[PDB]
C-alpha cells in the first residue's frame, strides 16, 4: 500500500488540481459520484463501505470563489466536505497577508488534515502539493505549509509542481518581489520542487498542435498528464519502477539543485498521428529537440545533468538503450563532463489515457522526461534584474511593511539568490 497526500493552494494550483482528478478517475472505473461498478488505487484514494470511493487531496485557499465553484459544481459527490476549506478575503497578493496576518487563521485547521489522513495510512511516500511562484497566497501560504510539515513530520519527500514566472509575460507587478519569497522556502525544506511555465504551452499549441488562442483549460490537462505519467508508477506494476523517496537521492547532486524541467513527448492530434511514425527511436529524442519543452529557453547553452526518461505504454527495453546511446554520440546534446552517462529509464505497462473531448490523440506510447539542466540559470539571472530595479527606488515596500515585512530582508533573500547564481558557476565549471 503506497499512498500520497495532495494539497492545493491558490487558483493556479487548485484549477490544475481540479484538472487532475478527471484524469485519475478516467483511468479506472470510478464515476464522479464515487461509485465504482483491485488494490491499485490506494495511492490517491480510499474506500467507504457503501461502494463510494474517496480521494486523497485537501483543497484550501483564502479566497472562496474557486472552491465554491466545485461544491456547486458536478464534483462535490467525490471529496470530503470537511476537507474543502473556504475563507473570507484574500491576501492582497501580499506576503505578510498570506503568511503573517490573515494566513495564520486556517493553519491549525489545515495541518490537522494532513495529520488526519496520514494517521489512517499504512506507509507513506511523499506529498503532492500544487502552487505557483509569483503569487501572494500561492507563495506566502505554501511557504508556511512546508515549514510546518517537515519540522513536525520529518523524513518524507515533497513533490510540488509550480509555474515559473516567464521572462516575457506576467499578470502582476509585484512578482519579482513575490518569487523570492517562495524560493527562499523551497530551498530550505523542499526536496523535489518542479515547475513549468504558461508561455511554452502556448507555443506547443501552435506547432505540434494547431490550436491558436490557448485558453486556461487546455493548459491544465497537459500539466495533469505529466504528473499522471510520473505518479502512476505508484499504482501500476511495471518493468522498472521507482519510489518517490528513491528519486529524492539520485536526482539532487548537491543540496541546491532540485528544480528540473518536464516534457511529454507525443503531444499530437488525430491528423498527424495518422501520418507520423511515433516509435521508440524518435519519441525519445523529441524530448531533446529544442521545441518541446516547458521553459521558453535555449537548451543548447546548457548541459543536461541528470535525465530520468520515464516511459510508459507498450515499449520493449532493447529499443531504449539503442536510443539512449544514440543521444550521447550526437554532438549537439552536450553534457556535464564529470557526471556519468547521466540517463535513467523507467518502463511500465500502461498506455496514455485520453480524457474525451480534447485535442490529444490516441498514441500507444508516452515519455515523461525530468531533465536537470545547466540552461536554467539564465532564467534565474533575469528574475533578479527584475528585482533590484524596484529596490533602487524601494517601490511597493510599504504594503509589505504595512503587514509585517522589514526593509532589510529583501536584501537577505537577494544574496541568497546570489548564492544560487554562484552555485551553477561553481558546479558547472570543469573539475580539474
Amino acid at each position: 500500500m503506497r499512498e500520497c497526500i495532495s494539497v492545493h493552494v491558490g487558483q493556479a494550483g487548485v484549477q490544475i488540481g481540479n484538472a487532475c482528478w478527471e484524469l485519475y478517475c478516467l483511468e479506472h472505473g470510478i464515476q464522479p459520484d464515487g461509485q465504482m461498478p483491485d488494490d491499485s488505487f490506494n495511492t490517491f484514494f480510499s474506500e467507504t463501505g457503501a461502494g463510494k470511493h474517496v480521494p486523497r487531496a485537501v483543497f484550501v485557499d483564502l479566497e472562496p470563489t474557486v472552491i465554491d465553484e466545485v461544491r456547486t459544481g458536478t464534483y462535490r459527490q467525490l471529496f470530503h466536505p470537511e476537507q474543502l476549506i473556504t475563507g473570507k478575503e484574500d491576501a492582497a497578493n501580499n506576503y505578510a497577508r498570506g503568511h503573517y496576518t490573515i494566513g495564520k487563521e486556517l493553519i491549525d485547521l489545515v495541518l490537522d488534515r494532513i495529520r488526519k489522513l496520514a494517521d489512517q495510512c499504512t506507509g507513506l511516500q511523499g506529498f503532492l502539493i500544487f502552487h505557483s511562484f509569483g503569487g501572494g497566497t500561492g507563495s506566502g501560504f505554501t511557504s508556511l505549509l512546508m515549514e510546518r510539515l517537515s519540522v513536525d513530520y520529518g523524513k518524507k519527500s515533497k513533490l510540488e509542481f509550480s509555474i515559473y514566472p516567464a521572462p516575457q509575460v506576467s499578470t502582476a507587478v509585484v512578482e519579482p518581489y513575490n518569487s523570492i519569497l517562495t524560493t527562499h522556502t523551497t530551498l530550505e525544506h523542499s526536496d523535489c520542487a518542479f515547475m513549468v511555465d504558461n508561455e511554452a504551452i502556448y507555443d506547443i499549441c501552435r506547432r505540434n498542435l494547431d490550436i491558436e488562442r490557448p485558453t486556461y483549460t487546455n493548459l491544465n490537462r497537459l500539466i495533469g498528464q505529466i504528473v499522471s505519467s510520473i505518479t502512476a508508477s505508484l499504482r501500476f506494476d511495471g518493468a522498472l519502477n521507482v519510489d518517490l523517496t528513491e528519486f529524492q537521492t539520485n536526482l539532487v547532486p548537491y543540496p541546491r539543485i532540485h528544480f528540473p524541467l518536464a516534457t511529454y513527448a507525443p503531444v499530437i492530434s488525430a491528423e498527424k498521428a495518422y501520418h507520423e511514425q511515433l516509435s521508440v527511436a524518435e519519441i525519445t529524442n523529441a524530448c531533446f529537440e529544442p521545441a518541446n519543452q516547458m521553459v521558453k529557453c535555449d537548451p543548447r547553452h546548457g548541459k543536461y545533468m541528470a535525465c530520468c526518461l520515464l516511459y510508459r505504454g507498450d515499449v520493449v527495453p532493447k529499443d531504449v538503450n539503442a536510443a539512449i546511446a544514440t543521444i550521447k554520440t550526437k554532438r549537439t546534446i552536450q553534457f556535464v563532463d564529470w557526471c556519468p552517462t547521466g540517463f535513467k529509464v523507467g518502463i511500465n505497462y500502461q498506455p496514455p489515457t485520453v480524457v474525451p473531448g480534447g485535442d490529444l490523440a490516441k498514441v500507444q506510447r508516452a515519455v515523461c522526461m525530468l531533465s536537470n539542466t545547466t540552461a536554467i540559470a539564465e532564467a534565474w539571472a533575469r528574475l533578479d534584474h527584475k528585482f533590484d530595479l524596484m529596490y533602487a527606488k524601494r517601490a511597493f515596500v510599504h504594503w509589505y511593511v504595512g503587514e509585517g515585512m522589514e526593509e532589510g530582508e529583501f536584501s537577505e533573500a537577494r544574496e541568497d539568490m546570489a548564492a544560487l547564481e554562484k552555485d551553477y558557476e561553481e558546479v558547472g565549471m570543469d573539475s580539474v
Binding site: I211, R213, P214, A270, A273, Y274, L278, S279, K362, R365
Partner: protein, 49 residues
C-alpha cells in the same frame, strides 16, 4: 437567433481557428476517433517471437 447568427453567417470566417478546438480535423484524418493510431505494434514482435 444566436445559434442562427453563429451558425449560418459566421461559419465563413472563423472556420480555420476556433477557441479551444483545434480545427475541422475530419476531412484530414481518414479514420475513426476511437481507433488506435501509433507507429506500429510491438505486439507483432511479441507474437512473432
Amino acid at each position: 437567433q444566436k445559434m442562427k447568427d453563429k451558425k449560418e453567417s459566421v461559419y465563413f470566417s472563423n472556420q480555420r481557428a476556433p477557441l479551444g478546438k483545434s480545427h475541422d480535423q475530419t476531412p484530414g484524418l481518414p479514420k475513426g476517433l476511437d481507433i488506435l493510431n501509433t507507429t506500429f505494434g510491438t505486439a507483432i514482435v511479441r507474437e512473432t517471437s
